[PDB]
Amino acid sequence: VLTMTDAQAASASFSAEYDIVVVGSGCAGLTSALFSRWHGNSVVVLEKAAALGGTTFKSAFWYWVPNNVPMRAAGIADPKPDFLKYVARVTRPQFYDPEHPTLGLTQWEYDMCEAIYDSASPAAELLAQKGALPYRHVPFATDFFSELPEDKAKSGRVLTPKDGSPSMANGGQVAIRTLSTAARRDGIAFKTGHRVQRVILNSKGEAIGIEALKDDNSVVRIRARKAVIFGSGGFTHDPELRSNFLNVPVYGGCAAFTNEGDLVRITSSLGVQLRNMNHAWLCPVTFEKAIGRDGSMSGMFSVAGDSMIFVDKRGKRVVNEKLNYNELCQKLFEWDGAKVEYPNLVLISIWDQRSQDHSASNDYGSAIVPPGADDRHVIKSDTLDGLSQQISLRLKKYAGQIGHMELSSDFNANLRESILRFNGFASTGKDEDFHRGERASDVLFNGSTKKEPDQKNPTMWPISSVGPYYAALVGGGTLDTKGGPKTNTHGQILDIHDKPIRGLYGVGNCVASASSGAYWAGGATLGPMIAFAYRAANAAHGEPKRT
Amino acid sequence: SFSAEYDIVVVGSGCAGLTSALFSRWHGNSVVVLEKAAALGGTTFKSAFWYWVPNNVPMRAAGIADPKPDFLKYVARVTRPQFYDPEHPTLGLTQWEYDMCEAIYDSASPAAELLAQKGALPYRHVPFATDFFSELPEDKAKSGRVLTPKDGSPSMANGGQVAIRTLSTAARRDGIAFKTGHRVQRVILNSKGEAIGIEALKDDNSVVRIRARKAVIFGSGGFTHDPELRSNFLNVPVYGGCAAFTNEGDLVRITSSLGVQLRNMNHAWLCPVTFEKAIGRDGSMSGMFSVAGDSMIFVDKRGKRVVNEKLNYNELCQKLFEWDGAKVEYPNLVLISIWDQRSQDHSASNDYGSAIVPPGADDRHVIKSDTLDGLSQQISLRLKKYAGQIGHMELSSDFNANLRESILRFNGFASTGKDEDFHRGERASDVLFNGSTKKEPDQKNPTMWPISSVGPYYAALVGGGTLDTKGGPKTNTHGQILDIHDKPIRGLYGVGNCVASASSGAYWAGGATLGPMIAFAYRAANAAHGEPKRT
Ligand SMILES: *Cc1cc2c(cc1C)nc1c(=O)[nH]c(=O)nc-1n2C[C@H](O)[C@H](O)[C@H](O)COP(=O)(O)OP(=O)(O)OC[C@H]1O[C@@H](n2cnc3c(N)ncnc32)[C@H](O)[C@@H]1O
Ligand SMILES: *Cc1cc2c(cc1C)nc1c(=O)[nH]c(=O)nc-1n2C[C@H](O)[C@H](O)[C@H](O)COP(=O)(O)OP(=O)(O)OC[C@H]1O[C@@H](n2cnc3c(N)ncnc32)[C@H](O)[C@@H]1O
């Protein structure tokens, strides 16, 4: 924090002044800046990196917008009481109660969920109308827990950028292009290489600006007449914060590497409530790309291959490999208190030539990659016994990160047994152990497969008894974190007495999500974020101009 | 401007605050202890006051060495299993965790010796208490490290009451002032940003300001009983815990506008609890450190075993929060302990959180029926009572048949002594906390005996809870609370569960909360004594 006396605030103390100062150039920052600019305010976006877009650039930009205009025009109602029941059941399973006045949620979580329902659609419509985020409907994207009877609009809520690829995998690049192009068009200023590091307060404790560290190690002070709106992302890539706050000891994530939790430090001397700090948006990752800091990494949202299993270091299956990524990641952190170890800490995806040829993908974090792609993480052997030798060497390379994990002495025998058992399940279509393929979301993210006339369940096919074979290490990671200072439903960052710190706002992964540890559907990070960017810019516009 | 002034102002009257106050007073300082409750002792009063003191005087005199390199390998291996490396310069720990562990080894014994010498905490050795992971080859002093108050009962279950008696009696004798009904709510700073005192809310809702000339030392306990903080920070959604109910995380609020580093906020000292005593806020509740009964199993709502019921409490609690992402539920959220008349008569205990309790004890949580089919009807009624806390979980339609199968299977393992599913009884800690059992000449494994085919039967709901939390502002090894640049704020100190533990999610041994705490109370008081008098 920097505090200015009245004299200082009214002097030549600032190198620049705007009505609204936005911090970060991902979805939260760009949309907050656009909505602010369209209310007639002067706006600057300050970005720590040399490039715009943050994690959002990397995303597929599915965005889950309840009650949106396309789904209604398509005749698909999204009744508010039933929307609230779906999200309450998924978010707070222990406390969900359809007879309780807030469904078993706290008043804050209920109010935040209502705010997503009320505001995501008008936000989406305005961004599209102005040309900053034109969209198309994604009617076939079903919610991640659509089988729950509380979900009364099981598909229809997803939008994505109009010019996203067919697979949607580059939707984030298209969104950052449209949003940033519109923002520049619209007279929003951008300052890159500006790492915000303090909020400046006046004598009344109101936010009146920021201090940023520039790349020459000089500092600048920039005045906000109305509001400072943080959209600075999460803290996946500050390992100390990640380790000390999250509920699982993840290895990294697909978040931009500049997402280091600066707002946690900035607000440490402002009296905020840090909330939801124990949760991230979770996903499995290609382990070596996380340790190797491959900035192109995606989370493993689609675990590719039908003639493919995951095994643990014993050579046994432990999980439905097609389970929703936010839930599958948690299996990797099961704790064995007797052995003082995480038995699933790394799992090994193993596949055959059929899945290599017909399930490879450049998209959605697949470990199986097509010719010409980066395959440094793919282990290869002509035989299963050779493959285990190579898996062992790979585990040894990372010993100091994974408890000096070793394959069981019985790995080879156990893997052969596991494959024979899996192949029987693949032949009947019924995975009696882990129910792979029996929920619709398992199929949604199944990936590509070779068409087989006899195939009973599209998520499984027997692994060939002839090589070659392929493997990759899978570890647990994030998309990014989703905890931070608590806001009200208009994005105002609160003090410990639940009262706004005047002039201070936050949107997106830098503030607390109301979704706890849950991931409701594809697009469940960005759709709510656009709702709160809209509500925050609307409230920020109403602030008095201050000194 | 201040209504009272002391050299050292201590906040909280459990182990951390009383020992910090005593060590401060014995350096010649004037000292006050401010306590929020209208009684002294906090969670410490409820404890068994085992305290794990590496390299202590009794174990050495008994010929038991505790070599420092091997102590550090044991705690590093247990605390940070992914990163533990015997060839790494700090064993794979961060420099801070390594230095804090070294500080425990260096200072716990002199702290224990001085408290005993002055008469504030006389002790006896507990040589047979083995470390919780003594089978690990890194542990080269597998037993000997535990002390307990001299006059604790044979079972040690009232050691906390004895310790609070000896410590508080000594403190009053020694001229330490006490102010109860004083809820500290702010640190007062001078213009240089140094702590110079506190503000406390008194019971008449008036506020008083008290000056500290040298230091303010927080020993205010954890945040188990602020449900919002508990829910938003811990790695598991626990229902409560045996912490004193005044442990509401006030230091988290107090330091929110001081620029601290909150660390280890994701971890608590964990234990199963008798679930109804947690929901019912029975202040006498203990964590279930000893899961009583040999003719006893835990089953889930399907009527099947899912865990070794004798596993170390800090690890067993975690099984209750296994997540089933396909059904969007916690399958083990409540487990049901079921036992027969033999364990009722021969494994009951008033101590260590046992669900099986002797005649005369509070048995409100004990579900009863003369048959197993009647018992499941009663278990269902009990789960229905708490539906809004446990996801409306219900017993399986097949519960009765499944329970009969589970019992026949368990009884075969009890007959051979070999629990082929969950290895009950195969680690020494399973025996350490096994509890009492009826002597049986032919018993192969002391943790199991076949459950009778004739009633009556008994059950209790088991849920997950804490002892207390162990996250908060980061200190250095001298107890000084740090700013975000790792520099001491300062005059400001903290000790015990109100600041970050260096033990992550681990529970090294019985006494692994209090022994380290006494080390840091000593180090903090020694550093606080060296502060200049200010403001
Ligand atoms: C990794 C990933 C995530 C993802 C996804 C695919 C991948 C590969 N697909 C998604 C999808 O289709 N739908 C969805 O709902 N979520 C999806 N995700 C998650 C999503 O990408 C993120 O949740 C979202 O993009 C986060 O947006 P937000 O605006 O909160 O954050 P950001 O895009 O990371 O941008 C933050 C920016 O702030 C800058 N920053 C950081 N610190 C500072 C300071 N001190 N000063 C100035 N700027 C700062 C960062 O550099 C970054 O640019
Ligand atoms: C529940 C329990 C825990 C326990 C145990 C048995 C039971 C039933 N047995 C143990 C054992 O044998 N060995 C061991 O190592 N640990 C054991 N535990 C855990 C142990 O009890 C605790 O970790 C330890 O006692 C905590 O000590 P600490 O001094 O940190 O905390 P406290 O005893 O809870 O005292 C805190 C006091 O601070 C007061 N307070 C709180 N807020 C304020 C404010 N704002 N102002 C003033 N005072 C405040 C509390 O009221 C309390 O008295």
Author numbering:
A (entry chain AAA): 52 to 598
B (entry chain BaB): 64 to 598
Describing publication, verbatim:
Additionally, the final product is often contaminated with side products due to over oxidation and therefore requires considerable purification efforts. This manuscript focuses on a cyclohexanone dehydrogenase (CDH), EC number 1.3.99.14, an enzyme which can perform α,β-desaturation of carbonyl compounds with exquisite selectivity. CDHs belongs to the succinate dehydrogenase/fumarate reductase flavoprotein superfamily and use flavin adenine dinucleotide (FAD) as a cofactor to perform the dehydrogenation of cyclic ketones. The natural substrate for CDHs is cyclohexanone, a simple cyclic ketone. The SelenoMet WT CDH crystal structure was solved using single wavelength anomalous diffraction (SAD), using the selenium atom as the dispersion centre. The crystal structure of WT CDH is organised into two domains: a catalytic domain (Cd) which is situated at the ‘top’ of the enzyme when viewed in the orientation shown in Fig. 3A and an FAD binding domain (Fd) which is situated at the ‘bottom’.
To investigate substrate binding, a catalytic variant, Y195F, was generated and used to obtain a crystallographic complex with the natural substrate, cyclohexanone. Initial refinement of the amino acid chains and FAD cofactors against the Y195F density map, revealed strong residual electron density in the putative active sites. Upon evaluation this was found to be entirely consistent with the structure of 2-cyclohexen-1-one, the reaction product, and not the cyclohexanone substrate as expected. 2-cyclohexen-1-one was subsequently modelled to produce the Y195F complex structure. The occurrence of the product rather than substrate in the “inactive” mutant may be due to residual enzymatic desaturation and modification to phenol via tautomerisation. The Y195F complex was refined to the higher final resolution of 1.33 Å, compared to WT CDH (1.86 Å). An 11 amino acid stretch at the N terminus, that was disordered in the wild-type form, was found to be structured in the complex form. Significantly more structured waters were identified and refined in the complex form (1037 as opposed to 570). There is a funnel leading to the active site and three molecules of the product 2-cyclohexen-1-one (abbreviated using the PDB designation A2Q1–3), resulting from oxidation of the substrate cyclohexanone, were found in association with each protein molecule. The active site of the Y195F variant exists as a small chamber formed between the domains and contains four catalytic residues: Tyr195 (substituted by Phe in this study), Tyr376, Tyr570 and Gly574.
